[PDB]
Each structure stands twice: as C-alpha cells, then as structure tokens.
C-alpha cells in the first residue's frame, strides 16, 4: 500500500525466489500451450 | 656531377626541374673540407634551364614569396588560430608576410604598378584586396563566415579542420559538397580521390595496363574508369593499403604522394563526418586513417601493427580465419597448437596481449526524460609497453543510437601510460527521444590501432524514464507590486529606498509568502530575488508573534556570511530583530538559537543541532524554516541539507505547531516533487522558468573542441577577450577560471591582447589618480600590476582584505573586468554584465581526472550576470569543451532536475536518528527513510536509484535493502547493535559519532586502529587517516612540494604516495604543529583541515575514554 | 491501370534518379542500355 | 625553462640534425628530437624535448592544432634553416610561420630570437626585413667566395 | 557466379540501397483480416535493406512481441541476422534458432528475406524453409510466424508478408525437391497477411557475436549444422570488409618493395 | 491549380485520394468528426 514495510533480506530472496518460480511456471505453462497450439496447427494440415 | 635536374614531382604530376635547395644541397657536397682544395661540381641540364641554375649558385637568383599560391590557407590558419578576426588584423599579419616587403620592393613583379604604389605608399589597399580574394575563396568555400559589410571573420569547423589537417580551401569544398551520411566504403576512396591535392595527378598511358592489373586486384570497387584520375587516385591508396608491388615509377610516385596526402586527407574526411555526427562514416573514415597509417586492411590480423612478428606467422593466423578475440581466452600453450607453431606461441600471447583492448562498463541513469547520463567506466585490459604504445593511448568514444548513424556524443579519451590498469570514469550526457530507442552503442576505438574497438550495447529495455515534468507556474503579469501592499511601516521602512516596486515574481509570490502560512516552494532563477521571499515569509513570522524564530539554511557558508551581512543591516538595524549566524560549534550554537530571532546557518552547522530535536526546545519550536537553494540537494555537501530539511519537516509533524518551511531554489524540473517533501501545495509551488528573470540572460555558449585541457585553457584566452569585447565593451566582466593559479594567467592574458591592440587601459574606466588608496592595500603585487590595467582577479589565496578591496573597485565601475576563480562563484558580493565561464572543468587529481563542474557551480556562475537595475540584459559567454557543449544546452535553459544522492551519504544519518532513538528498529528506518527526498524521487526517476519499478513491492524492498545495508554496515562498524535482526539501538561508538558529527567509517577506524599504546607520533597518522579528509583538494602541480614537505616534518611517512589525500592532510597538520611557512594554496588546506581537527581528536578523546586507555588518552 | 501506371511510375522516375546520379558520377550520359527496362514506363514516359 | 626550434626544410636533414645536435648538446643534457608522429605524439615530444628539429610544415601544421601552444612562452628561438626555400613552393609554410612568430612578438611582447640561414641569393635584405634582422647588427652576407 | 568482377558491380550497386529505403511499397491484397497485423519497424527495415544485396537473397529471422491490450497485432522488435548464405532463390541459414537472453522476452514472428525482383507468389523455397524451421522448432507458432519478402523492384522496395497455412506446412515439411517448381507446390500454401510500417517504435539487431553475419564469401566457413551465439550489434552490409575475406586477405605480402621507390618526404607527417 | 504539366487528371484523381487518406486521423469520426468533400464550377467563370 502506501507505507513501505520493511522485508528482511532472507524474506525478500524467499520472495523473489516465490516469484521467480511464478514466472517460471508460467513460462513452463506458455510453453506446453505452444505445443497445444502446434499440435491443432499441425493436424488441420495432416 | 649532379646528371639530369630532372625529377618527377606527383604533385604537379609531371618531370619537373630540381629546385633550388636540392641543387644548392647537392653542390654542397663538392669539395671536401679536409682532403680539397678545390670542388668541382658539373651540372648537366637542359640548356634553357641554365640561366636559372647559373643564377642560383652565383648569388643571382632572387628570394621571391610564393604566397599567393597558398594565402587563402594561411589566412584560413590565421583565421582559425583567431589571430586575425577582421579583414584589418589579416591586413595587418600580410603585412608580416615576406610577401608584403616583396611586393613594397618589387611592384611590377606581383601584378602592382607604380601607379598603384604612388597611391598607396604603404600598400594598405592591395593588402586589403589581396585578404578580400582570400576571404572570398574561403567563404565561397564555407570555411569562414566572411561579411563584406564588417569585414569580420568568422571561423567554421571546416575552416578548423582544414587549417588543422593542411587541406586546401577546394579539398574541404569538395568534402563539403560530397560527404553525405550515407557514403559507402567505395564512395569514400571516390570523395578521398577528388580531393584537390590531386588535381594535378593524371593518369598517362603508359602505366595504364599497370593500372588494370591493379584494378582487377583492389579489394574496394571504382566507379570511375580507369583513364579518369580519381579512379587512379583510388587504385593507387588500395594498392598501398594492399600492399601490392607496383612496377611504374611515375605510378610508384604517384602512389607516395596519394598515400603521404591521404594520412592527413582521411583524418580531415573523419573530423568532418564525425563533427556532424555519421556514426557509419565515421567509423570508415576512422578506419581508413587507421589503414592508410597501419597500411593493411582491417580485415588482416591485428598483429600486423606490431611490426615485430613474422610475417609467415601473421598468414598463418589469417589463414586460420578464426575471430581475433578467439586469441585472447586461450593459453600460450594453445594459442602456438592452434597456430601449429608452438614456437612462436609465447610471442603471439606477449602480442595479443599487448593489444589495445579496454573493457568497458555502463552505468545510465535518467536525469530527465530526454536526456541520460552514462557513467562509462574503461577499463585497461591489456600490458602496457612503452616501445608498442608509447606515452599515451588515444581512443574516441562514440555514443550513437540503434541506427549507427547520428553519434550522440563523441569524445577523445587520452589513456596515458601513469594511469594504465585502472577504471577512468568518462561521464557524460546524452539525449533520448521520443520513439524511445532499445539501445545506445558505446564504440570506444583506437585512434591509432585497427581493429582496436569495444562496442557497449546500453540496453534501454528495463529503463524507465522520468515522467515529463509539469510546466512552470507562469508569470502572471500581475501589477507590480508596490511596498504599501506590505502591512507594517517598520516593515516597508527597509524597502522605501531599495525599489518602489518588486519584481514580477515577488509579486506573485508575495500574498502567498506574507499573507498565507503554507509550506511554499519558490522555484525562480539566480537572480531573481528569492531571498526576499524568504524575507517575506520572516516578515510573517515576525507579525505573528514578535518571539519567532526563522531560521535559514544556505549550502555554502559564504552564502551564509553574505546574507548575515545583508539581514544584520536589515533586520537588526532597523527592525531590532536579532539575527544571528551560526558557527561550527555546538556550545555557542544553542545559545545563538536560543537568542536569535533570524537563525542562519549551513546544513552541518545545522544538522549537528537538529540531530538532538527531543533534547534541544529551541530547535522544536522554531516558527519558519527558510532552506535557500535547495537545488543544492543534487551536489556534494547535499544529503545533509535533505536530511536537515526531512527531519525539519518530521518534526513539524509531531510539535503541535507546525513549521513552516519556505524552500527557496533554482527553477526545478521536479519541483513537485520538492514540493510534496516539503509539504507545500499545489498553489504555493511557485516552480518558474529559467526564461522568468527580471534582467533577460543571453547566454551563449562557445564549444572549443580541445581535449588536451591546459591547450584549450590557453587557446580560450584570446576568446575571452573577443567575449568581451563583443558582448560586454563598456560594462562589468567576470570570468570565472578553473583555479587558483588560472586567475592570474587570464588576467595578464586579458591585459597582453588589450594591450596587443591599441586600446590599453580600457578596462580602467577611473584614473591611476583613484587607485592609489586602494592599491596600496594590497600584498599581491602582480594584482597591482593587473589592477593599474583595469583587470583585477580574485581567488582563495588572496585576503578577505584583497578580495573585498577587489569587489569594492569592481561594485564601484572602477575596473572592468575580475577574473575570479571557481570556487568564489558563490561568495562574491559582486555582480557583473557579462559573465565568462572559462573551461567548465576543473582537476580532481584524486582520480586524475578533469571532472566537470558541477551545474549549482555553472548555474550560479550564470546568475552573476545579474545587475537588475543598471543593465538591460544580461550576457554569459560559457567557453566549455564542445563534448560538453550539449550538457549546458540543456541544463540551463530549461529548469534543472535535482536527485537526492542520500542513498550513499546514508550511515552518518541513520546513526543520528539511531542514537536519538528516532530509529529504534529497520521498519522505523525505512519509515524515517519515507521522509526524505530520496523516497520521493525514487517514485518519480526510479533507474537513478539502481530501482526496477514504482510499485510498493519495488520500493519497499528497495528502501529495506538500502536501510539493512546501511546498518549491516553500522554493526559491522560496530556503531550500532541490532537484536532479533530487527531493532536497533545505539552502541558507544556510534553515540560518538553522532555527537561530535563525525562519518561512521572514521570512527570504524580509530576504535580499529588505537591500541593502548599509541601516541602523538601516531596519533596524527590516525586522525589523518579521518575520511573527513578524503574531500581535500589534490589539484595538478600539488605532488612535488609534498615530497618536499615530506622530508622536513617531525615525522617521516611509511608508503607516502602524494595522491592521497590523508597523507597531504598528515604532512598539512605536521607543518602547522612545526608552524612552517607553507605556499598560499596549501594553507588553504590547512585551513580547512584544522576547522575538522578538533572534533577528531575529540573523538579520540572519546573512543579511548571508553576503552579504558589512559596514556592514549592523554595523548589525544 | 493506373495505379499500376502510378506506382511504376514512382519507381521508375526514382530508378532514373539513381541511375542518373550514378552516371553523373561516372560522367557520361544515360544511353538505351541503361534505362532499357524502364522504357514504356513511367507518367511522363522515360522514352521523353 | 627553454625550448629551441631548428626548422629545417628536408626531413632527412632533421632526421641528421638531430643526431648531430645530440652529439653536440649531449655534454648539457639537452634532449634534441624530431617532431613526427600524430598530434599527441608530437605534443608529448614537445614536452619532452628542448631542441626540436622539425620542417616547416610539421611546425606549421603543429601551430595550426595548436600542440606548442602550452610551450610558446618556452620558445625563445626559431633557427630557421634554409630560408631561401622563401622561394620555394613550400614557401608560404615558412611565411606563415614567422609571420605568426612576429605576430605574436609584436602581440604577445615576449622575445623570440628568429635565426634565418640561408644560401646567399638575391633579396637577401628583404627576407632580413622578413625577420625583424637589423641590417646592420643581424644581417651578414657572405658571398660563394666565403 | 562470375566472381572476379561480378561483385565489383553488384558492391556498387549495393552501396546505393539507401535510395531504395524511402521508396517502400507494401503490398496491401489478399490478406485475409482474420489473422495478426505485424509492425515492422522503418529503422530495422531501412537497415534491412541498406546491408543486403540486389542479387544474393539475406536473411533475418524476426522477433518481436504483441503492443498491451493488442494481441492481434504483432510489434516485430527485432532482425536477427545469423551466419547464412544465400543464392538468387533461396537462403541457407544454420539449424540452430537464435538464442539470446533479449530474445527470451519476445516472441519468434518469423523471417524477413529480400528478394531480387518481385514476384506476386511465395517462393516454394521460402514456404519449404519456413517449414522445415517449423518442423524442427517447436517455438514456431504457424499462426504468428511468417516471412516478410523485401522484393527489389526497380529503384524501391516491395514488401509481402506471408504466412503459412496448415497444408503449407505439412507440404513444405515433406518437401526435398529444391527447385523453382516443386511436386505438390499450390498457392493455398500460404496466404498473405497484414503487414505494415512505423515511425512509432525502432527496432534493433542481433548479429553474430564471434563472426559476422554474410557467409556468401565464406561459403565453405558455413555449415548448416553450425552454432553460433548473438550479440547486440548493429549488422555490416553486405560488400563489408569482413564479409570477403578473400579480397583483403591474399594478398602477396611486399616481399623486396619499396626499393626502388619513391623519395618522397612526409613534411606534414 | 491543375492541370499540372506533371501530373494527368487520372494522376490528380490518385494524388487527392491519398491526399484526403493521408490527413490525420481523417476517417476517425468518434468525437464527431467530420469531413466535407465539396465540388463546384464558379459558374459563368468565363462569362463573368
């Protein structure tokens, strides 16, 4: 919100541990869709 | 027997006969002086050639001048070296010319007749024709602005680059017409080859088959045919840089000259095309000069430009085309087995690695939206050798956008051989658009090596500029304000004679200043008059209850002594209010602010009270806080100011009163941000323009495109005076110079060039009759000397009594012009019509560095060309380096941005508010972190603050981690003591070094570095040790005269080496306890050292009071 | 059609320019050769 | 405290002068050189050096840059070597030259010493008017039977 | 080719492509208005187009990402030029796909290629070459990816983006025959897509960071199995002086010249 | 004025089409906009 809470640095790497973990779940969801959406590309031609 | 007198010269491009000095050199060989009595020297010629040689070794041949050939490129040298500016001073350097006194003497040999020397008997008109035909060559070739009207000259930078680089009036003409930015690299040879060098080069028959056997092998098309010169011209530079075997002689000499010229050719093609910025062009260019010097292509290795390999070595790498940085990673043992000579594997590694390689580091912050400021951080990553290198290494730093195709910023950048193996920090400023780039390139080339280049890519993915700035409030044309708008008659009794009216922004800023209680920012230039605003408001304070107590913050302490002496006349005299100013010590200071009902101050004279706000009632209650100059919160010396400013404005939040804080400043750019740190509306941010100023600034700027600093500083003298001569003849000059020594230099080189014309003493606009009483005070003669003249100067060493002897005869319209130095911008009680602002650089000899100045120091240099009633307007003429012309195009005509640098000057604060028990743990640090300037602008311009986003998670993690750094960095110090890795509280240490106001890493020393067997030998080792003396000067010529204060002292120095500042500091307070004499500049130091000594050394006391030492103790 | 016409047009006049400027460079004058593919093309036609 | 100039007007002749003038000056420690080299070397040689034997051109086209301008006040003689290529097409850079040394006797007010050798031709008194010689103290004429 | 003097005239040439670079056309028919709209940026096309050749097809394989609340559109912020060669007809990249760490955060929209005259169908060589990078790159998507041809028309530049559809790449991932008309070859292989320029936003470049990005001299230098890493430069043309190596690089080194030379005197040097 | 020497009315026709494309935001009609094509004669110009 408005006041800035201080995070202890053990929090704060746990925190960008938890969001670099989001970020790469969502890469890894992004990637299996991209396969999702190759495989209907591919067998509307096949 | 000299046989034939014929040689071919490729400049005329013909067989020519020999000339005069060959012939008389050649027989003077005959004879020998100790075997002969007699030479005999045969001469065989043509027989119509010998009447001339028979003339020239029988005394008979005449000296005639040939400059007629050449006068348009002397007179463009003259021009360009600003000896002639006018059509009468290139008169008058023809007249110095061997062609004047041959066309005086002989007439009708240089087209004169004796009609035109009976009408003209000193030959005043011929000169004047002939410097007319010059100047008309040179304009109609754009190398000078030429007037037919004035007669003045003024200079291009083509005129520099062909006077620099010998190139003809025609050659930059051609260069002119034919660089475009995009030329290729067969276009280039093609401009190159129509150079008018070469206009005499044709191309015969006879090496024409030659010439196709060369075509068919350049690696670099023609466009041209091959009977046409220019593709002779180009083939002939491409089979030199080839190095291909010619076979003609005419084509072998040809090839000579072409490539002899094409040295200085190319280098004026790549000043030409990177003075207007083509960043392609100019890496061609550059890289022509570089193979046309080196003579190999680039795409050949690298070790071809030393000279000491093998060259069956050498094709051997070219053979094996991998890239040559593929060479630096590997091993002297793999660098010979990739090579398959494992014989010459350890001169190939000595070799790659004595070539030029820097490493070079970014780092960008945002100043405003439109412009960055890269730090560029060159590091030497390869072994210096004399015998490759020499005394320097030159690089060009070219900063260009994604295109490559408009350098943003060029710059030279001397690497020299004292200062290899460490980081040179280049920082400069570039602009960015509004399609805002993803990348700038930073290209830093060898001037002198091929294939010597880093490219930097400064990505601009992750940058977030700074949000466009709000417009200034504008100058609502109010009627101007007569002083009986003021209430009180003892009030208007101290303006009645002053003005009848204020000045538009006093107008505006009045009914909210006087006749409102707000927090109000008034943003206004220098010169404005902001500090009768900062009156208005003490005159409030001063209806509201007679018992107030303003109290006002200047950054610097002239600034303070200037407005002590100003409101000591005005408001003691005459309004019986006390004003006092305060002093560095903390027992007289809280009688003074218990006393005075006007509070002056700096910020660390003000910080050390303000520190103890719950002890001390009198800083409490306090019922207005000035703060002039608060766009000093950007500079050295400035986090102390943010953090006195935030905690008066934390305080007026808690003390059932508030305090009201009027903020004076330059004109700001984020002025709302200033203003929502000092609490100050929306209506009573008076944020105005640089354009505001009662008397209107025309400030020019004047690029001098010098890198060699003492050269551009000696090449400025002369403009100077044509400054102020053009700008400011019969009214006041200040010419701020970098240093102490340079005002005596430009004030004698101001006095030779008036006196250099005829119009001596024309800056004395009294009589010698006059300056008698106020000559005859003074110590320095050499300012007597100047002063007779009318230039008087004025710097630290001088006396308080010189300097305001010298600021009575200038105030007075005496004397005309005062070269003052750098540091005196802002106390000089003094204010001129023009302003010159020499060389905008100064050396910091800790980095070994010129470090530019600082914009508060330029801005206020600018706001001395300020005299509100006696002049119209007023003019500023900034001589700078023209790689930091732009820097001053931008930050002085539009409003400035200020950026709190508290996040390094953090731990002296924290500490404060530590042993206060204002921070009692890190989340009353982050939220006494909230109440500074910092916090408010790393929401604004967050990539200035190494920040990543505006959100709260950013910025909260961000002030945690800066708040648990500073206090790692205070218990590691062991000043302060955290427990449960949350609270903090006060250790012994720290209670030390927030009470005598000492940095926390000084203190991190002396408890680290006093045993119980220490004494005063060491003692002044230690105290000098103080990073309270990191910011002594360490200026060029300062070494010596150490090393000659080193072997005198009472004490000898382990390791002296005379850049440091703490061992100057050391040998300064060893010469004052031995009462030496010293010179005037290093008692200068000592002065500003001795001021920070007591306190140490109380600190000293302190910390080995606490340890339990008693001979240490009393020691100290 | 025409804004065939126009467009070849465009291309061809802007062809001519650099073919122009290129033999400017190399002094002579445009022949048939050059110009050859351009010929019944163009708004005012090349042919002119 | 002091630099000379020697302005000779072939290089090799430099290249040979500056031998013998490091043979000779060697006993003073007088550092005699060629100025050659890009500006900054030339600059840095200058720095260096007291004698500096140099063309016309490379003195002329370091005066144009502007790399003695830090030792001009050191420059207290020019040695102009071969005056009589006045005559030559080179000869402009020689005119230039002292005209801008004069100049700036006749500005700047410090002395240079200006030391024309030449080879004994014709006008002879008008390139001592050249230099500022006074034709009775300074100039001296020895004909081919000297 | 020619390859004594045929480059000379074809250098020549190529150093005048920046006359071709405000005269750009793009082809505005039969695009479908179903798909995505893709931004080519006029900064990487006019560079594009100055470092190619009129006669040897380039290459460069495009990235970029989508504008904010716009997923229909398709923002091309990047031309990687890699290590390829190419012939009038088609060009011969590497197996390898760029990979960058400034490439992670965009997506791959396909290849740009010049063409040497315009012709109003797809090449059968591009939709085999796109096919087969689909085929073996997983991280091309036939929906966005695509193949914008810079055709040299007369005195300007042609651009035709295309995509391929579902039989395209089944076909063009089948495919062997590499000539000018293939078995199986229909225009219903590809259909053209909205494509369009900006002054909005720039783009930038990604060459090879160990070489350079022309192989057309190297052509023995180049294998199509080959690795390479990137770097955030700014491409060379195409007649640059490290591209022909050969041309610089074997020369007779002087071997007893400068012996009978000229005596000439650098005065000014 | 038209006729221009370098442009035939067809061209006229094309240049004024993409003239009237090519203003801005030309065909954005959301707050209201709107574009007025007129045509006329000056009639009797000749006689008058």
Known sequence: EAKPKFLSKAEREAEALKRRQQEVEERQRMLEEERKKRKQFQDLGR | ?1116 | PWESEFIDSQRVWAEYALKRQEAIAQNRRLTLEDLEDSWDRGIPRINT | DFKIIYIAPMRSLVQEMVGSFGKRLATYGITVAELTGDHQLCKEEISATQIIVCTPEKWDIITRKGGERTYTQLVRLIILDEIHLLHDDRGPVLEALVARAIRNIEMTQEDVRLIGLSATLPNYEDVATFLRVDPAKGLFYFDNSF | FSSKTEWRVRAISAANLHLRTNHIYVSSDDIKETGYTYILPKNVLKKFICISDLRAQIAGYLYGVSPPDNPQVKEIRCIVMVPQWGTHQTVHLPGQLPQHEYLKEMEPLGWIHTQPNESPQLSPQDVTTHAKIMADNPSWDGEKTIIITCSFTPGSCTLTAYKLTPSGYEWGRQNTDKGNNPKGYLPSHYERVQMLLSDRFLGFFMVPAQSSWNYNFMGVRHDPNMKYELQLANPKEFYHEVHRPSHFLNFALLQEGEVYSADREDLYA | IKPADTEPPPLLVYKWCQGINNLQDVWETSEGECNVMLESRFEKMYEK
Not at chain 2, 452 to 464: D, G, M, N, W
Not at chain 2, 836 to 842: A, E
Not at chain 2, 1060 to 1067: A, C, I, R
């Open chain 2, 1 to 1116: 027997i000299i046989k034939g007198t014929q040689v071919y010269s490729p400049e005329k491009g013909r067989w020519t006969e020999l000339g005069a000095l060959d012939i008389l050199q050649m027989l003077g060989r005959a004879g020998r002086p100790q075997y002969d009595t007699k030479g005999e020297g045969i001469l065989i010629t043509s027989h119509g050639e010998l009447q001339y040689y028979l003339s020239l070794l029988n005394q008979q041949l005449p000296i005639e001048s040939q400059m007629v050939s050449k006068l348009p490129d002397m007179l463009n040298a003259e021009i360009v070296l600003g000896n002639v500016q006018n059509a009468k001073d290139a008169v008058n350097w023809l007249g110095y010319a061997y062609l004047y006194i041959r066309m005086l003497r002989s007439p009708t040999l240089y087209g004169i007749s004796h009609d035109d020397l009976k009408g003209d008997p000193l030959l005043d008109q011929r000169r004047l024709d002939l410097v007319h035909t010059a100047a008309l060559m040179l304009d109609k070739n754009n190398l000078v602005k030429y007037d037919k009207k004035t007669g003045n000259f003024q200079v291009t930078e083509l005129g520099r680059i062909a006077s620099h680089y010998y190139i003809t009036n025609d050659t930059v003409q051609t260069y002119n017409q034919l660089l475009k930015p995009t030329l290729s690299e067969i276009e280039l040879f093609r401009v190159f080859s129509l150079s008018s060098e070469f206009k005499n080069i044709t191309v015969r028959e006879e090496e024409k088959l030659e010439l196709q056997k060369l075509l068919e092998r350049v690696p670099i098309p023609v466009k041209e045919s091959i009977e046409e010169p220019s593709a002779k011209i180009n083939v002939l530079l491409q089979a030199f840089i080839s190095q291909l075997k010619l076979e003609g002689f005419a084509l072998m000499a040809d090839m000579v000259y072409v490539t002899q010229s094409a040295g200085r050719l190319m280098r004026a093609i790549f000043e030409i095309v990177l003075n207007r910025g083509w960043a392609q062009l100019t890496d061609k260019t550059l890289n022509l000069c570089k193979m046309i010097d080196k003579r190999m292509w680039q795409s050949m290795c690298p070790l071809r430009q030393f000279r000491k390999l093998p060259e069956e070595v050498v094709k051997k790498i070219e053979k094996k085309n991998f890239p040559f940085e593929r060479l630096y990673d590997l091993n002297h043992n793999e660098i010979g087995e990739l090579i398959r000579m494992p014989k010459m594997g350890k001169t190939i590694h000595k070799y790659v690695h004595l070539f030029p390689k820097l490493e070079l580091s970014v780092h960008l912050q945002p100043i405003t939206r439109s412009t960055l400021k890269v730090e560029l951080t060159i590091t030497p990553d390869f072994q210096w050798d004399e015998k490759v290198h020499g005394s320097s290494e030159a690089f060009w730093i070219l900063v260009e956008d994604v295109d490559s195709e408009v350098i943003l910023h060029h710059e030279y950048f001397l690497l020299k051989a004292k200062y290899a193996q460490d980081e040179h920090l280049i920082t400069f400023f570039v602009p960015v658009f509004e399609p805002l780039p993803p990348q700038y390139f930073i290209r830093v080339v060898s001037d002198r090596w091929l294939s010597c280049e880093t490219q930097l890519p400064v990505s601009f993915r992750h940058l977030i500029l700074p949000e466009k700035y709000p417009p200034p409030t504008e100058l609502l044309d109010l009627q101007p304000l007569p002083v009986s708008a003021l209430r009180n008659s003892a009030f208007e009794s101290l303006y009645q004679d002053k003005f009848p009216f204020f000045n538009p922004i006093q107008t505006q800023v009045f009914n909210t200043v006087y006749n409102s209680d707000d927090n109000v920012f008034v943003g206004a230039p220098t010169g404005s008059g902001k500090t009768i605003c900062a009156e208005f408001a003490i005159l409030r304070m001063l209806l509201q209850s007679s018992e107030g107590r303003c109290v006002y913050i200047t950054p610097m302490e002239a600034l303070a002594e200037q407005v002590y002496m100003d409101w000591y006349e005005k408001f003691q005299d005459r309004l019986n209010k006390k004003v006092v100013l305060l002093t560095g010590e903390t027992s007289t200071d809280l009688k003074l602010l218990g006393k005075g009902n006007i509070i002056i101050s700096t910020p660390e004279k003000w910080d050390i009270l303000s520190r103890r706000w719950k002890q001390r009632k009198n800083v409490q209650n306090i019922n207005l806080f000035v703060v002039d100059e608060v766009h000093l919160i950007g500079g050295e010396n400035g986090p102390v100011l943010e953090v006195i400013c935030s905690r008066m404005r934390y305080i007026s939040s808690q003390i059932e009163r508030p305090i009201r804080i009027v903020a004076l400043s330059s004109s700001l750019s984020n002025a709302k941000d200033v203003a929502h740190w000092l609490g100050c509306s929306a209506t009573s941010t008076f944020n105005f323009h640089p354009n505001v100023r009662p008397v209107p600034l025309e400030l020019h700027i004047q690029g001098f495109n010098i890198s060699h600093t003492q050269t551009r500083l000696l090449s400025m003298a002369k403009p100077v005076y044509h400054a102020i001569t053009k700008h400011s003849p019969k009214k006041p000059v200040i010419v701020f110079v970098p240093s102490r020594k340079q005002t005596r230099l430009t004030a004698i080189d101001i006095l030779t060039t008036c006196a250099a014309d005829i119009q001596r003493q024309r800056f004395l606009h009294c009589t010698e009759k006059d300056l008698i009483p106020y000559l005859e005070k003074l110590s320095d003669s050499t300012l007597k000397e100047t002063l007779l003249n009318g230039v008087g100067y004025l710097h630290e060493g001088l006396s308080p009594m010189e300097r305001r002897l010298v600021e009575q005869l200038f105030s007075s319209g005496a004397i005309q012009v005062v070269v003052a130095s750098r540091s005196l911008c802002w106390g000089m009680n003094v204010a001129a019509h023009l302003v010159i602002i020499m060389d905008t650089q100064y050396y910091n000899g800790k980095i070994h560095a010129y470090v530019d100045y600082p914009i508060y120091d330029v801005l206020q240099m600018v706001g001395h060309a300020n005299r509100p009633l006696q002049d119209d307007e007023g003019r500023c003429v900034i001589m700078c380096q023209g790689s930091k012309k732009d820097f001053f195009k931008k930050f002085l005509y539009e409003p400035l941005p200020v950026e709190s640098h508290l996040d390094h000057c953090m731990h002296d604060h924290f500490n404060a508010e530590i042993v206060t028990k204002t921070i009692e743990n890190k989340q009353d640090a982050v939220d006494y972190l909230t109440w500074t300037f910092l916090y408010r602008r790393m929401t604004q311009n967050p990539n200035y603050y190494n920040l990543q986003g505006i959100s709260h998670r950013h910025l909260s993690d961000h002030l945690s981690e800066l708040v648990e750094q500073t206090l790692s960095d205070l218990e590691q110090s062991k000043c302060i003591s955290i427990e449960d890795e949350m609270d903090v509280a006060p250790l012994n240490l720290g209670m030390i070094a927030a009470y005598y106001y000492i940095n926390y890493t000084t203190i991190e020393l002396f408890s680290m570095s006093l045993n119980a067997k220490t004494k005063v030998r060491g003692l002044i080792e230690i105290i000098s040790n103080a990073a309270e003396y990191e910011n002594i000067p360490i200026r060029h010529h300062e070494d010596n005269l150490l090393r000659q204060l080193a072997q005198k002292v009472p004490h000898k120095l382990n390791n002296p080496k005379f850049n440091d500042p703490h061992v100057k500091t050391n040998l300064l307070l060893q010469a004052h306890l031995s009462r030496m004499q010293l010179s005037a500049e290093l008692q200068s130091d000592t002065e500003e050292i001795l001021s920070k000594a007591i306190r140490l050394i109380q600190a000293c006391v302190d910390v080995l009071s606490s340890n339990g030492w008693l001979s240490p103790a009393l020691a100290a």
